[PDB]
Amino acid sequence: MRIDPFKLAHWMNARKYTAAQTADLAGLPLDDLRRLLPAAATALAEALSVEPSQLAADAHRNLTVVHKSAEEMHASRRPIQRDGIHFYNYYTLAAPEGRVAPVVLDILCPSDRLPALNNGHLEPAITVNLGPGDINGRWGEEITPQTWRVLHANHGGDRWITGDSYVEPSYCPHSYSLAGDAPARIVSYTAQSNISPLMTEANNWSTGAFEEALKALSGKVSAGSVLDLFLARRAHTRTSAAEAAGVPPADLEAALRSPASETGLTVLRTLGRALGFDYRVLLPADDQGVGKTWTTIEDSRRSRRTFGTYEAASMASAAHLPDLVGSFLRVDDLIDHAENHYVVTEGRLTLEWDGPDGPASVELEPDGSAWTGPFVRHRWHGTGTVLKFGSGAHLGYQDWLELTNTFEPAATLRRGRR
Q: According to CB under 8 A, which residues from 357 to 396 bind its own copies?
A: 373-377, 388, 390, 393-395
Q: Binding residue per annotation — 320?
A: no
Stretch that binds its own copies, among 23-31, 149-157, 174-182, 224-232 (CB under 8 A): 224-232
Cα–Cα distance list, 122 to 118, 192, 261, 399 (Å): 12, 9, 34, 21
**Measured from the CB of residue 163, what is the shortest distance to its own copies in angstroms?**
18
Separation of alpha carbons 167 and 145, rounded Å: 17
The interface with its own copies within residues 175-214 (CB under 8 A) comprises 194-210, 212-214
Please report whether residue 8 would count as binding its own copies according to CB under 8 A.
no
Residue 311 labeled ligand binder = no
State the Cα–Cα distance between residues 322 and 311, nearest whole angstrom.
22
Residue in 261, 298, 332, 361 binding its own copies, rule: CB under 8 A: 261
- What letter would DSSP give residue 287? P
Piece of 142-150, 175-183, 341-349, 404-412 that binds its own copies (CB under 8 A)? 404-412
Q: How far apart are CA 308 and CA 224, in angstroms?
A: 45
Phi then psi dihedrals of residue 221, to 5 deg? -90, 95
Element (H, E) at 239: helix 238-245
How does strand 369-372 pair with strand 358-364?
unpaired
The pattern of x and - marking residues 99 through 128 that bind its own copies according to CB under 8 A reads -x--x-----------------xx------
Nearer residue to its own copies within complex by CB, 135 or 227: 227
Which helix (H) or strand (E) segment holds residue 107: the answer is strand 103-107
CB closer to its own copies out of 74 and 375: 375
SS3 85: strand
Residues of span 51-70 touching its own copies by CB under 8 A: 51, 53-54, 56-64
Binding test (CB under 8 A) with its own copies, winner from 70, 226, 254, 360:
226
Contacts of 133 (CB under 8 A, 6+ apart): 107, 153, 178, 179, 180, 181, 182, 183, 184
Annotated ligand binding at 292? The verdict is: no
129 belongs to an annotated ligand binding site: no
Q: Determine the Cα–Cα distance for residues 279 and 283; give it in Å rounded to an integer.
A: 7
- Contact residue for its own copies among 39, 218, 250, 291 (CB under 8 A): 218
Q: Are 293 and 137 spatial neighbours (Cβ–Cβ below 8 Å)?
A: no
Stretch that binds its own copies, among 25-33, 68-76, 175-183, 260-268 (CB under 8 A): 260-268
Minimum separation from the CB atom of position 279 to its own copies (A): 8
Residues 6 or more apart whose CB falls under 8 angstroms from that of 235 comprise none
Using CB under 8 A, which of 136, 175, 177, 314 touches its own copies?
Answer: 314
Q: Lay out the site mask for its own copies across 339-358 (x = CB under 8 A, - = otherwise).
A: ---------------xxx--
Q: How far apart are CA 208 and CA 322, in angstroms?
A: 33
Task: Pick between residue 90 and residue 132 the one whose CB is nearest to its own copies.
Answer: 90
**Is 410 strand, coil or helix?**
helix
* Closest approach of its own copies to the CB of residue 326, in Å: 9
Annotated binding-site residue numbers for Fe cation:
121, 174
Annotated binding site: 16, 90, 118, 121, 168, 174, 188
